[PDB]
Amino acid sequence: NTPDRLQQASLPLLSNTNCKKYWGTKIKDAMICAGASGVSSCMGDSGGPLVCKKNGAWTLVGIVSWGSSTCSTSTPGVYARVTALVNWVQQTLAAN
Amino acid sequence: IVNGEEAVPGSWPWQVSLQDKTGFHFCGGSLINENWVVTAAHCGVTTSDVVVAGEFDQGSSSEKIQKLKIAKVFKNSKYNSLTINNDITLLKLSTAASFSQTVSAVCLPSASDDFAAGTTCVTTGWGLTRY
Amino acid sequence: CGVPAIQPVL
């Protein structure tokens, strides 16, 4: 059930509003949904990246967080929304 | 990741694995620079865990990997365990990662950056392929 | 940042 070799998968970002349709009130501003596309992040994926490519480089948009307890490929995966937290990151590096 | 595909070895250079004392991979991470890794707060990382960079095949003994000690865990004060909100933790490494072709950092966005619904992105990791 | 030396193939 657990892979030796690194896995990858392309998936689309959802809007929080649309995401709330699946998860309701569990969805907070600091969260961003992706998936519900035939792929799913799963146990052990947590903390890993959700990256989007633009102007040639990959940007961390999300952090694998939670989702379907079954890793259903038809339910959106929930990631920590990096934009909502990047200020904290930068402050933290700055001060340390 | 369920319904994923095997990545080109070393093509996701920021991808790190969080391992316990027993060598068990329990979470993923992303290098943002040579001294810091971004991960999820719920990963519950401790300075007893190790950051593993440059891995492809966690089963291979022939890869040039870097097992990096963690100097300090920085859990976002906004993190809410109950709702899993603001699920982010920063790990300051004791010794800096040696960047190479297979070990490098991901970019971070600006707080005002827009990531539009419908945009196709990619997620990577050693999580279950089958629940 | 963000540019793999070894380009990922999706």
JSON list of C-alpha atoms in Angstrom, two decimals:
[
{"chain": "A", "resi": 1, "resn": "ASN", "atom": "CA", "xyz": [0.00, 0.00, 0.00]},
{"chain": "A", "resi": 2, "resn": "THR", "atom": "CA", "xyz": [3.12, 2.16, 0.63]},
{"chain": "A", "resi": 3, "resn": "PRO", "atom": "CA", "xyz": [5.45, 2.97, -2.28]},
{"chain": "A", "resi": 4, "resn": "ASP", "atom": "CA", "xyz": [9.23, 2.79, -2.24]},
{"chain": "A", "resi": 5, "resn": "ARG", "atom": "CA", "xyz": [9.52, 5.17, -5.18]},
{"chain": "A", "resi": 6, "resn": "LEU", "atom": "CA", "xyz": [8.46, 8.78, -5.20]},
{"chain": "A", "resi": 7, "resn": "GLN", "atom": "CA", "xyz": [5.02, 9.30, -6.69]},
{"chain": "A", "resi": 8, "resn": "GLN", "atom": "CA", "xyz": [3.58, 12.38, -8.36]},
{"chain": "A", "resi": 9, "resn": "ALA", "atom": "CA", "xyz": [0.20, 13.52, -9.71]},
{"chain": "A", "resi": 10, "resn": "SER", "atom": "CA", "xyz": [-1.24, 16.58, -11.45]},
{"chain": "A", "resi": 11, "resn": "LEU", "atom": "CA", "xyz": [-4.53, 17.88, -9.97]},
{"chain": "A", "resi": 12, "resn": "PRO", "atom": "CA", "xyz": [-6.60, 21.07, -10.14]},
{"chain": "A", "resi": 13, "resn": "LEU", "atom": "CA", "xyz": [-7.14, 23.68, -7.45]},
{"chain": "A", "resi": 14, "resn": "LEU", "atom": "CA", "xyz": [-10.73, 24.12, -6.23]},
{"chain": "A", "resi": 15, "resn": "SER", "atom": "CA", "xyz": [-12.36, 27.29, -4.85]},
{"chain": "A", "resi": 16, "resn": "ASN", "atom": "CA", "xyz": [-13.06, 27.25, -1.10]},
{"chain": "A", "resi": 17, "resn": "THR", "atom": "CA", "xyz": [-16.73, 27.84, -1.89]},
{"chain": "A", "resi": 18, "resn": "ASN", "atom": "CA", "xyz": [-16.91, 24.73, -4.10]},
{"chain": "A", "resi": 19, "resn": "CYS", "atom": "CA", "xyz": [-14.85, 22.80, -1.61]},
{"chain": "A", "resi": 20, "resn": "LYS", "atom": "CA", "xyz": [-17.31, 23.63, 1.17]},
{"chain": "A", "resi": 21, "resn": "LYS", "atom": "CA", "xyz": [-19.82, 21.59, -0.81]},
{"chain": "A", "resi": 22, "resn": "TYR", "atom": "CA", "xyz": [-17.83, 18.48, 0.09]},
{"chain": "A", "resi": 23, "resn": "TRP", "atom": "CA", "xyz": [-16.34, 19.48, 3.41]},
{"chain": "A", "resi": 24, "resn": "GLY", "atom": "CA", "xyz": [-18.63, 22.26, 4.61]},
{"chain": "A", "resi": 25, "resn": "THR", "atom": "CA", "xyz": [-17.55, 24.16, 7.69]},
{"chain": "A", "resi": 26, "resn": "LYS", "atom": "CA", "xyz": [-14.30, 22.20, 8.01]},
{"chain": "A", "resi": 27, "resn": "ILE", "atom": "CA", "xyz": [-12.94, 24.42, 5.24]},
{"chain": "A", "resi": 28, "resn": "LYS", "atom": "CA", "xyz": [-11.19, 27.53, 6.58]},
{"chain": "A", "resi": 29, "resn": "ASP", "atom": "CA", "xyz": [-9.57, 30.49, 4.77]},
{"chain": "A", "resi": 30, "resn": "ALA", "atom": "CA", "xyz": [-6.11, 29.08, 5.52]},
{"chain": "A", "resi": 31, "resn": "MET", "atom": "CA", "xyz": [-7.05, 25.94, 3.60]},
{"chain": "A", "resi": 32, "resn": "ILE", "atom": "CA", "xyz": [-7.01, 25.25, -0.17]},
{"chain": "A", "resi": 33, "resn": "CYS", "atom": "CA", "xyz": [-8.53, 22.19, -1.83]},
{"chain": "A", "resi": 34, "resn": "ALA", "atom": "CA", "xyz": [-7.16, 20.32, -4.85]},
{"chain": "A", "resi": 35, "resn": "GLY", "atom": "CA", "xyz": [-8.03, 16.97, -6.44]},
{"chain": "A", "resi": 36, "resn": "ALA", "atom": "CA", "xyz": [-11.47, 15.36, -6.72]},
{"chain": "A", "resi": 37, "resn": "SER", "atom": "CA", "xyz": [-9.97, 14.60, -10.12]},
{"chain": "A", "resi": 38, "resn": "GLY", "atom": "CA", "xyz": [-9.21, 10.87, -10.11]},
{"chain": "A", "resi": 39, "resn": "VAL", "atom": "CA", "xyz": [-6.11, 11.14, -7.87]},
{"chain": "A", "resi": 40, "resn": "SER", "atom": "CA", "xyz": [-5.76, 11.69, -4.11]},
{"chain": "A", "resi": 41, "resn": "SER", "atom": "CA", "xyz": [-3.01, 12.55, -1.65]},
{"chain": "A", "resi": 42, "resn": "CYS", "atom": "CA", "xyz": [-3.13, 9.89, 1.17]},
{"chain": "A", "resi": 43, "resn": "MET", "atom": "CA", "xyz": [-1.66, 8.88, 4.54]},
{"chain": "A", "resi": 44, "resn": "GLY", "atom": "CA", "xyz": [2.10, 9.51, 4.45]},
{"chain": "A", "resi": 45, "resn": "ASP", "atom": "CA", "xyz": [1.76, 12.34, 1.89]},
{"chain": "A", "resi": 46, "resn": "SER", "atom": "CA", "xyz": [1.11, 14.84, 4.71]},
{"chain": "A", "resi": 47, "resn": "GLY", "atom": "CA", "xyz": [3.51, 17.79, 4.93]},
{"chain": "A", "resi": 48, "resn": "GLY", "atom": "CA", "xyz": [4.62, 17.33, 1.31]},
{"chain": "A", "resi": 49, "resn": "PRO", "atom": "CA", "xyz": [4.11, 19.81, -1.51]},
{"chain": "A", "resi": 50, "resn": "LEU", "atom": "CA", "xyz": [1.32, 21.04, -3.66]},
{"chain": "A", "resi": 51, "resn": "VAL", "atom": "CA", "xyz": [3.21, 23.05, -6.34]},
{"chain": "A", "resi": 52, "resn": "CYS", "atom": "CA", "xyz": [2.04, 25.15, -9.28]},
{"chain": "A", "resi": 53, "resn": "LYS", "atom": "CA", "xyz": [4.27, 26.08, -12.21]},
{"chain": "A", "resi": 54, "resn": "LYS", "atom": "CA", "xyz": [4.28, 29.67, -13.52]},
{"chain": "A", "resi": 55, "resn": "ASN", "atom": "CA", "xyz": [6.85, 31.86, -15.30]},
{"chain": "A", "resi": 56, "resn": "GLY", "atom": "CA", "xyz": [8.99, 28.71, -15.43]},
{"chain": "A", "resi": 57, "resn": "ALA", "atom": "CA", "xyz": [9.28, 27.77, -11.74]},
{"chain": "A", "resi": 58, "resn": "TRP", "atom": "CA", "xyz": [7.34, 25.71, -9.20]},
{"chain": "A", "resi": 59, "resn": "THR", "atom": "CA", "xyz": [5.76, 27.53, -6.23]},
{"chain": "A", "resi": 60, "resn": "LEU", "atom": "CA", "xyz": [4.56, 25.89, -3.03]},
{"chain": "A", "resi": 61, "resn": "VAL", "atom": "CA", "xyz": [0.85, 26.73, -3.05]},
{"chain": "A", "resi": 62, "resn": "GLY", "atom": "CA", "xyz": [-0.18, 24.00, -0.62]},
{"chain": "A", "resi": 63, "resn": "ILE", "atom": "CA", "xyz": [1.04, 21.60, 2.05]},
{"chain": "A", "resi": 64, "resn": "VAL", "atom": "CA", "xyz": [-0.55, 18.12, 2.12]},
{"chain": "A", "resi": 65, "resn": "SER", "atom": "CA", "xyz": [-2.92, 18.34, 5.13]},
{"chain": "A", "resi": 66, "resn": "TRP", "atom": "CA", "xyz": [-6.06, 16.15, 5.25]},
{"chain": "A", "resi": 67, "resn": "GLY", "atom": "CA", "xyz": [-8.90, 14.77, 3.18]},
{"chain": "A", "resi": 68, "resn": "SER", "atom": "CA", "xyz": [-11.08, 11.70, 2.74]},
{"chain": "A", "resi": 69, "resn": "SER", "atom": "CA", "xyz": [-10.29, 9.05, 5.36]},
{"chain": "A", "resi": 70, "resn": "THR", "atom": "CA", "xyz": [-10.33, 6.67, 2.43]},
{"chain": "A", "resi": 71, "resn": "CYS", "atom": "CA", "xyz": [-8.29, 8.77, -0.01]},
{"chain": "A", "resi": 72, "resn": "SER", "atom": "CA", "xyz": [-11.28, 8.79, -2.31]},
{"chain": "A", "resi": 73, "resn": "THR", "atom": "CA", "xyz": [-10.20, 10.10, -5.73]},
{"chain": "A", "resi": 74, "resn": "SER", "atom": "CA", "xyz": [-13.55, 11.89, -6.04]},
{"chain": "A", "resi": 75, "resn": "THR", "atom": "CA", "xyz": [-13.32, 14.08, -2.96]},
{"chain": "A", "resi": 76, "resn": "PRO", "atom": "CA", "xyz": [-11.04, 17.08, -2.76]},
{"chain": "A", "resi": 77, "resn": "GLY", "atom": "CA", "xyz": [-7.85, 16.84, -0.76]},
{"chain": "A", "resi": 78, "resn": "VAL", "atom": "CA", "xyz": [-7.27, 19.69, 1.73]},
{"chain": "A", "resi": 79, "resn": "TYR", "atom": "CA", "xyz": [-3.92, 21.46, 1.88]},
{"chain": "A", "resi": 80, "resn": "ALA", "atom": "CA", "xyz": [-2.56, 24.26, 4.08]},
{"chain": "A", "resi": 81, "resn": "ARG", "atom": "CA", "xyz": [-2.93, 27.45, 1.94]},
{"chain": "A", "resi": 82, "resn": "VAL", "atom": "CA", "xyz": [0.64, 28.77, 1.71]},
{"chain": "A", "resi": 83, "resn": "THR", "atom": "CA", "xyz": [-0.41, 32.36, 0.82]},
{"chain": "A", "resi": 84, "resn": "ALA", "atom": "CA", "xyz": [-2.18, 32.65, 4.18]},
{"chain": "A", "resi": 85, "resn": "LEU", "atom": "CA", "xyz": [0.95, 31.44, 5.94]},
{"chain": "A", "resi": 86, "resn": "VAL", "atom": "CA", "xyz": [3.90, 32.76, 3.98]},
{"chain": "A", "resi": 87, "resn": "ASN", "atom": "CA", "xyz": [4.06, 35.92, 6.12]},
{"chain": "A", "resi": 88, "resn": "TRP", "atom": "CA", "xyz": [4.60, 33.73, 9.17]},
{"chain": "A", "resi": 89, "resn": "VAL", "atom": "CA", "xyz": [7.28, 31.71, 7.32]},
{"chain": "A", "resi": 90, "resn": "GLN", "atom": "CA", "xyz": [9.24, 34.81, 6.28]},
{"chain": "A", "resi": 91, "resn": "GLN", "atom": "CA", "xyz": [8.99, 36.32, 9.79]},
{"chain": "A", "resi": 92, "resn": "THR", "atom": "CA", "xyz": [10.23, 33.04, 11.29]},
{"chain": "A", "resi": 93, "resn": "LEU", "atom": "CA", "xyz": [13.24, 32.77, 8.96]},
{"chain": "A", "resi": 94, "resn": "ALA", "atom": "CA", "xyz": [13.97, 36.46, 9.51]},
{"chain": "A", "resi": 95, "resn": "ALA", "atom": "CA", "xyz": [14.04, 36.08, 13.28]},
{"chain": "A", "resi": 96, "resn": "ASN", "atom": "CA", "xyz": [16.03, 32.81, 13.25]},
{"chain": "B", "resi": 1, "resn": "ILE", "atom": "CA", "xyz": [-0.84, 9.43, -3.60]},
{"chain": "B", "resi": 2, "resn": "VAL", "atom": "CA", "xyz": [-3.56, 7.22, -5.10]},
{"chain": "B", "resi": 3, "resn": "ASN", "atom": "CA", "xyz": [-3.63, 6.98, -8.90]},
{"chain": "B", "resi": 4, "resn": "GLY", "atom": "CA", "xyz": [-0.33, 8.78, -9.24]},
{"chain": "B", "resi": 5, "resn": "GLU", "atom": "CA", "xyz": [2.71, 7.77, -11.25]},
{"chain": "B", "resi": 6, "resn": "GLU", "atom": "CA", "xyz": [6.34, 7.31, -10.45]},
{"chain": "B", "resi": 7, "resn": "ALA", "atom": "CA", "xyz": [8.35, 10.51, -10.70]},
{"chain": "B", "resi": 8, "resn": "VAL", "atom": "CA", "xyz": [11.58, 10.97, -12.70]},
{"chain": "B", "resi": 9, "resn": "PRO", "atom": "CA", "xyz": [14.27, 10.35, -10.08]},
{"chain": "B", "resi": 10, "resn": "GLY", "atom": "CA", "xyz": [15.34, 13.60, -8.49]},
{"chain": "B", "resi": 11, "resn": "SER", "atom": "CA", "xyz": [12.89, 15.80, -10.44]},
{"chain": "B", "resi": 12, "resn": "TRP", "atom": "CA", "xyz": [11.21, 17.15, -7.25]},
{"chain": "B", "resi": 13, "resn": "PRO", "atom": "CA", "xyz": [14.42, 18.26, -5.53]},
{"chain": "B", "resi": 14, "resn": "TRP", "atom": "CA", "xyz": [12.71, 20.08, -2.63]},
{"chain": "B", "resi": 15, "resn": "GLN", "atom": "CA", "xyz": [10.76, 16.94, -1.67]},
{"chain": "B", "resi": 16, "resn": "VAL", "atom": "CA", "xyz": [12.10, 15.61, 1.62]},
{"chain": "B", "resi": 17, "resn": "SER", "atom": "CA", "xyz": [10.93, 12.71, 3.76]},
{"chain": "B", "resi": 18, "resn": "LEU", "atom": "CA", "xyz": [10.46, 12.93, 7.55]},
{"chain": "B", "resi": 19, "resn": "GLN", "atom": "CA", "xyz": [11.72, 9.74, 9.22]},
{"chain": "B", "resi": 20, "resn": "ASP", "atom": "CA", "xyz": [11.55, 8.59, 12.85]},
{"chain": "B", "resi": 21, "resn": "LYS", "atom": "CA", "xyz": [14.33, 6.89, 14.81]},
{"chain": "B", "resi": 22, "resn": "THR", "atom": "CA", "xyz": [13.26, 3.55, 13.36]},
{"chain": "B", "resi": 23, "resn": "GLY", "atom": "CA", "xyz": [13.82, 4.85, 9.82]},
{"chain": "B", "resi": 24, "resn": "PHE", "atom": "CA", "xyz": [10.06, 4.98, 9.20]},
{"chain": "B", "resi": 25, "resn": "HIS", "atom": "CA", "xyz": [8.85, 7.62, 6.69]},
{"chain": "B", "resi": 26, "resn": "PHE", "atom": "CA", "xyz": [5.84, 9.34, 8.30]},
{"chain": "B", "resi": 27, "resn": "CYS", "atom": "CA", "xyz": [5.49, 12.66, 6.44]},
{"chain": "B", "resi": 28, "resn": "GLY", "atom": "CA", "xyz": [6.75, 14.70, 3.46]},
{"chain": "B", "resi": 29, "resn": "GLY", "atom": "CA", "xyz": [8.44, 18.14, 3.53]},
{"chain": "B", "resi": 30, "resn": "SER", "atom": "CA", "xyz": [9.75, 20.74, 1.08]},
{"chain": "B", "resi": 31, "resn": "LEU", "atom": "CA", "xyz": [13.12, 22.48, 1.24]},
{"chain": "B", "resi": 32, "resn": "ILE", "atom": "CA", "xyz": [12.69, 26.29, 0.93]},
{"chain": "B", "resi": 33, "resn": "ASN", "atom": "CA", "xyz": [16.42, 26.97, 1.41]},
{"chain": "B", "resi": 34, "resn": "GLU", "atom": "CA", "xyz": [19.47, 25.02, 2.62]},
{"chain": "B", "resi": 35, "resn": "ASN", "atom": "CA", "xyz": [18.50, 25.38, 6.25]},
{"chain": "B", "resi": 36, "resn": "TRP", "atom": "CA", "xyz": [14.74, 25.17, 6.39]},
{"chain": "B", "resi": 37, "resn": "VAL", "atom": "CA", "xyz": [12.04, 22.66, 5.57]},
{"chain": "B", "resi": 38, "resn": "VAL", "atom": "CA", "xyz": [8.31, 23.42, 5.38]},
{"chain": "B", "resi": 39, "resn": "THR", "atom": "CA", "xyz": [5.95, 20.65, 6.52]},
{"chain": "B", "resi": 40, "resn": "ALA", "atom": "CA", "xyz": [2.58, 20.13, 8.15]},
{"chain": "B", "resi": 41, "resn": "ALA", "atom": "CA", "xyz": [2.09, 20.95, 11.81]},
{"chain": "B", "resi": 42, "resn": "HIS", "atom": "CA", "xyz": [0.00, 17.78, 12.39]},
{"chain": "B", "resi": 43, "resn": "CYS", "atom": "CA", "xyz": [3.11, 15.79, 11.37]},
{"chain": "B", "resi": 44, "resn": "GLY", "atom": "CA", "xyz": [4.13, 16.32, 14.97]},
{"chain": "B", "resi": 45, "resn": "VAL", "atom": "CA", "xyz": [7.83, 16.51, 14.12]},
{"chain": "B", "resi": 46, "resn": "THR", "atom": "CA", "xyz": [10.30, 16.48, 16.99]},
{"chain": "B", "resi": 47, "resn": "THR", "atom": "CA", "xyz": [14.05, 17.07, 17.09]},
{"chain": "B", "resi": 48, "resn": "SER", "atom": "CA", "xyz": [14.30, 13.25, 17.34]},
{"chain": "B", "resi": 49, "resn": "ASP", "atom": "CA", "xyz": [13.11, 12.89, 13.76]},
{"chain": "B", "resi": 50, "resn": "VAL", "atom": "CA", "xyz": [15.35, 13.37, 10.73]},
{"chain": "B", "resi": 51, "resn": "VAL", "atom": "CA", "xyz": [14.90, 15.15, 7.39]},
{"chain": "B", "resi": 52, "resn": "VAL", "atom": "CA", "xyz": [15.89, 12.92, 4.44]},
{"chain": "B", "resi": 53, "resn": "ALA", "atom": "CA", "xyz": [16.69, 14.77, 1.21]},
{"chain": "B", "resi": 54, "resn": "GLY", "atom": "CA", "xyz": [17.59, 13.46, -2.26]},
{"chain": "B", "resi": 55, "resn": "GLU", "atom": "CA", "xyz": [15.72, 10.17, -2.08]},
{"chain": "B", "resi": 56, "resn": "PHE", "atom": "CA", "xyz": [13.81, 8.61, -4.98]},
{"chain": "B", "resi": 57, "resn": "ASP", "atom": "CA", "xyz": [13.54, 4.97, -3.90]},
{"chain": "B", "resi": 58, "resn": "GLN", "atom": "CA", "xyz": [13.21, 4.73, -0.13]},
{"chain": "B", "resi": 59, "resn": "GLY", "atom": "CA", "xyz": [14.07, 1.04, -0.59]},
{"chain": "B", "resi": 60, "resn": "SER", "atom": "CA", "xyz": [17.37, 1.66, -2.38]},
{"chain": "B", "resi": 61, "resn": "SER", "atom": "CA", "xyz": [20.67, 1.73, -0.50]},
{"chain": "B", "resi": 62, "resn": "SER", "atom": "CA", "xyz": [22.55, 3.10, -3.47]},
{"chain": "B", "resi": 63, "resn": "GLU", "atom": "CA", "xyz": [21.15, 6.64, -3.60]},
{"chain": "B", "resi": 64, "resn": "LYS", "atom": "CA", "xyz": [23.22, 9.63, -2.47]},
{"chain": "B", "resi": 65, "resn": "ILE", "atom": "CA", "xyz": [20.84, 10.84, 0.22]},
{"chain": "B", "resi": 66, "resn": "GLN", "atom": "CA", "xyz": [21.27, 13.35, 3.06]},
{"chain": "B", "resi": 67, "resn": "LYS", "atom": "CA", "xyz": [19.95, 12.47, 6.54]},
{"chain": "B", "resi": 68, "resn": "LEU", "atom": "CA", "xyz": [19.68, 15.85, 8.20]},
{"chain": "B", "resi": 69, "resn": "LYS", "atom": "CA", "xyz": [19.30, 16.53, 11.89]},
{"chain": "B", "resi": 70, "resn": "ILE", "atom": "CA", "xyz": [16.60, 18.94, 13.01]},
{"chain": "B", "resi": 71, "resn": "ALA", "atom": "CA", "xyz": [17.78, 21.81, 15.24]},
{"chain": "B", "resi": 72, "resn": "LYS", "atom": "CA", "xyz": [14.30, 23.16, 16.05]},
{"chain": "B", "resi": 73, "resn": "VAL", "atom": "CA", "xyz": [10.60, 22.75, 15.31]},
{"chain": "B", "resi": 74, "resn": "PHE", "atom": "CA", "xyz": [8.64, 25.94, 14.62]},
{"chain": "B", "resi": 75, "resn": "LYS", "atom": "CA", "xyz": [4.93, 25.19, 14.74]},
{"chain": "B", "resi": 76, "resn": "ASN", "atom": "CA", "xyz": [2.80, 28.15, 13.58]},
{"chain": "B", "resi": 77, "resn": "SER", "atom": "CA", "xyz": [1.17, 29.70, 16.66]},
{"chain": "B", "resi": 78, "resn": "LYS", "atom": "CA", "xyz": [-2.06, 29.91, 14.61]},
{"chain": "B", "resi": 79, "resn": "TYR", "atom": "CA", "xyz": [-2.14, 26.14, 14.22]},
{"chain": "B", "resi": 80, "resn": "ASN", "atom": "CA", "xyz": [-5.39, 24.68, 15.49]},
{"chain": "B", "resi": 81, "resn": "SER", "atom": "CA", "xyz": [-5.19, 20.99, 16.21]},
{"chain": "B", "resi": 82, "resn": "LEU", "atom": "CA", "xyz": [-8.95, 20.65, 16.54]},
{"chain": "B", "resi": 83, "resn": "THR", "atom": "CA", "xyz": [-9.75, 21.97, 13.09]},
{"chain": "B", "resi": 84, "resn": "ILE", "atom": "CA", "xyz": [-6.35, 21.22, 11.53]},
{"chain": "B", "resi": 85, "resn": "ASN", "atom": "CA", "xyz": [-6.18, 24.89, 10.43]},
{"chain": "B", "resi": 86, "resn": "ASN", "atom": "CA", "xyz": [-2.97, 26.77, 9.66]},
{"chain": "B", "resi": 87, "resn": "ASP", "atom": "CA", "xyz": [-1.38, 23.33, 9.36]},
{"chain": "B", "resi": 88, "resn": "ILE", "atom": "CA", "xyz": [2.24, 24.39, 8.92]},
{"chain": "B", "resi": 89, "resn": "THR", "atom": "CA", "xyz": [5.49, 23.77, 10.75]},
{"chain": "B", "resi": 90, "resn": "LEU", "atom": "CA", "xyz": [9.01, 25.01, 9.90]},
{"chain": "B", "resi": 91, "resn": "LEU", "atom": "CA", "xyz": [12.03, 22.80, 10.66]},
{"chain": "B", "resi": 92, "resn": "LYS", "atom": "CA", "xyz": [15.37, 24.48, 11.14]},
{"chain": "B", "resi": 93, "resn": "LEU", "atom": "CA", "xyz": [18.14, 21.98, 10.25]},
{"chain": "B", "resi": 94, "resn": "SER", "atom": "CA", "xyz": [21.22, 21.67, 12.46]},
{"chain": "B", "resi": 95, "resn": "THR", "atom": "CA", "xyz": [23.46, 21.45, 9.44]},
{"chain": "B", "resi": 96, "resn": "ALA", "atom": "CA", "xyz": [22.61, 22.90, 6.06]},
{"chain": "B", "resi": 97, "resn": "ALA", "atom": "CA", "xyz": [21.57, 20.66, 3.19]},
{"chain": "B", "resi": 98, "resn": "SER", "atom": "CA", "xyz": [24.08, 20.38, 0.35]},
{"chain": "B", "resi": 99, "resn": "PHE", "atom": "CA", "xyz": [22.19, 21.50, -2.77]},
{"chain": "B", "resi": 100, "resn": "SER", "atom": "CA", "xyz": [22.78, 19.43, -5.89]},
{"chain": "B", "resi": 101, "resn": "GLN", "atom": "CA", "xyz": [20.96, 18.33, -9.00]},
{"chain": "B", "resi": 102, "resn": "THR", "atom": "CA", "xyz": [18.65, 16.29, -6.77]},
{"chain": "B", "resi": 103, "resn": "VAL", "atom": "CA", "xyz": [18.43, 18.62, -3.74]},
{"chain": "B", "resi": 104, "resn": "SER", "atom": "CA", "xyz": [17.21, 22.23, -4.18]},
{"chain": "B", "resi": 105, "resn": "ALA", "atom": "CA", "xyz": [14.38, 24.51, -2.98]},
{"chain": "B", "resi": 106, "resn": "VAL", "atom": "CA", "xyz": [10.83, 25.25, -4.00]},
{"chain": "B", "resi": 107, "resn": "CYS", "atom": "CA", "xyz": [9.68, 28.87, -4.39]},
{"chain": "B", "resi": 108, "resn": "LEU", "atom": "CA", "xyz": [7.23, 30.47, -1.95]},
{"chain": "B", "resi": 109, "resn": "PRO", "atom": "CA", "xyz": [4.42, 32.77, -3.11]},
{"chain": "B", "resi": 110, "resn": "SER", "atom": "CA", "xyz": [3.62, 36.32, -2.06]},
{"chain": "B", "resi": 111, "resn": "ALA", "atom": "CA", "xyz": [0.76, 36.66, 0.46]},
{"chain": "B", "resi": 112, "resn": "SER", "atom": "CA", "xyz": [-1.25, 38.48, -2.28]},
{"chain": "B", "resi": 113, "resn": "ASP", "atom": "CA", "xyz": [-0.62, 35.77, -4.91]},
{"chain": "B", "resi": 114, "resn": "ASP", "atom": "CA", "xyz": [-3.67, 34.37, -6.69]},
{"chain": "B", "resi": 115, "resn": "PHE", "atom": "CA", "xyz": [-3.93, 30.64, -7.45]},
{"chain": "B", "resi": 116, "resn": "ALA", "atom": "CA", "xyz": [-7.13, 30.33, -9.44]},
{"chain": "B", "resi": 117, "resn": "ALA", "atom": "CA", "xyz": [-9.53, 27.41, -9.17]},
{"chain": "B", "resi": 118, "resn": "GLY", "atom": "CA", "xyz": [-9.08, 25.23, -12.28]},
{"chain": "B", "resi": 119, "resn": "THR", "atom": "CA", "xyz": [-5.29, 25.73, -12.29]},
{"chain": "B", "resi": 120, "resn": "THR", "atom": "CA", "xyz": [-3.48, 22.38, -12.69]},
{"chain": "B", "resi": 121, "resn": "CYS", "atom": "CA", "xyz": [-0.78, 21.86, -10.04]},
{"chain": "B", "resi": 122, "resn": "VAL", "atom": "CA", "xyz": [1.20, 18.79, -8.88]},
{"chain": "B", "resi": 123, "resn": "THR", "atom": "CA", "xyz": [1.53, 16.99, -5.55]},
{"chain": "B", "resi": 124, "resn": "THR", "atom": "CA", "xyz": [4.30, 14.45, -4.75]},
{"chain": "B", "resi": 125, "resn": "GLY", "atom": "CA", "xyz": [5.10, 11.98, -1.95]},
{"chain": "B", "resi": 126, "resn": "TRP", "atom": "CA", "xyz": [5.57, 8.47, -0.55]},
{"chain": "B", "resi": 127, "resn": "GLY", "atom": "CA", "xyz": [2.04, 8.22, 0.86]},
{"chain": "B", "resi": 128, "resn": "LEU", "atom": "CA", "xyz": [-0.19, 5.19, 0.25]},
{"chain": "B", "resi": 129, "resn": "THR", "atom": "CA", "xyz": [-1.01, 4.36, -3.36]},
{"chain": "B", "resi": 130, "resn": "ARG", "atom": "CA", "xyz": [-3.83, 2.18, -2.03]},
{"chain": "B", "resi": 131, "resn": "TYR", "atom": "CA", "xyz": [-5.80, 2.84, 1.14]},
{"chain": "C", "resi": 1, "resn": "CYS", "atom": "CA", "xyz": [14.18, 28.43, -6.41]},
{"chain": "C", "resi": 2, "resn": "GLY", "atom": "CA", "xyz": [11.60, 26.33, -8.20]},
{"chain": "C", "resi": 3, "resn": "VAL", "atom": "CA", "xyz": [13.59, 25.08, -11.19]},
{"chain": "C", "resi": 4, "resn": "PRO", "atom": "CA", "xyz": [14.58, 21.42, -10.94]},
{"chain": "C", "resi": 5, "resn": "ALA", "atom": "CA", "xyz": [17.97, 20.56, -12.46]},
{"chain": "C", "resi": 6, "resn": "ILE", "atom": "CA", "xyz": [16.25, 17.33, -13.58]},
{"chain": "C", "resi": 7, "resn": "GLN", "atom": "CA", "xyz": [12.97, 18.37, -15.21]},
{"chain": "C", "resi": 8, "resn": "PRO", "atom": "CA", "xyz": [9.93, 16.50, -13.98]},
{"chain": "C", "resi": 9, "resn": "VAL", "atom": "CA", "xyz": [7.82, 14.82, -16.64]},
{"chain": "C", "resi": 10, "resn": "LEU", "atom": "CA", "xyz": [4.11, 14.71, -15.94]}
]
